[PDB]
Amino acid sequence: MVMEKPSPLLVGREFVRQYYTLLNQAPDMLHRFYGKNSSYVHADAVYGQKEIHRKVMSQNFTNCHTKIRHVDAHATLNDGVVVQVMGLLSNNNQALRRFMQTFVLAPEGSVANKFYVHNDIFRYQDEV
Template sequence: MVSVIESNASPDSAFTVVRMEPSDILSLAGQFVVQYYTVMKKCPSGIHRFYKDDSSMIREDTPVCGQRMIHEKIMSMNLQDSQIAILKLDALRANGNSVLIHVAGEISIANEEFRRFTQCFILREQAPCDFYVLNDIFRYQDYVYGDLKNNVETNDDHLAKVNEYSPSENVSHCSMPHSARDVRSYS
């Protein structure tokens, strides 16, 4: 279950906290994503509360660190009334009691055309069942790939290294359950 906890703290303090039971990582991720994108759409001025002073984010090659700077960056993006469609959600337990979340979807900002994006979060547990966003990377897919037919540049040396790579016998592979979550829209 996700809940938002608020107090009368100043806007620079972290007073919105995501609380979830960590036993089901994919459920935790789904609940977090619903809350995160709902706040982003309806009240982008409050989304910085998912972050703390040690948090960092990247938006199209621009790294931003700290809750105040994240707030400024988010406010410059004009996210009010954005439309978001989540096409795929994956999650894994990360180091300690952290959770790695990968989102693939489409977003329309300011009634522009939908653009495909991916976003990765690392949620850090700050107290039992109490998480915040430690790291956040957002990338538009058209920014990464552009027009593949006309813009593909290859470096034969790099391709040769990739093609020669094979995992060593010392690498252990584990079976991870695939996420079955297919959340469609938070508009």
């Protein structure tokens, strides 16, 4: 069975599902989403899979619970997809906190329809 390829919205929503699920289950594996040019800010940005992994591990994600309230995802430059996420996130069984998170997904360039995260920008509302 063949079906037309996913829209940017489906791509974005599916990525969001993958990302937050992995953040709960095995945050030590999150680094697979990133490449050498990737930028992560969760505060100076850190770059590349190695440094991003280090930053993710330093946050001590444990039993991370996420409720996504809205996802916007749109085609952007050079076949990328820009994603805006609004939701609530909990870590270490503390209270849920509202956040927004902006992603830019970019074609990975070696596999059809495969994307990596070129930009990952997260901010809690309470800190702002």
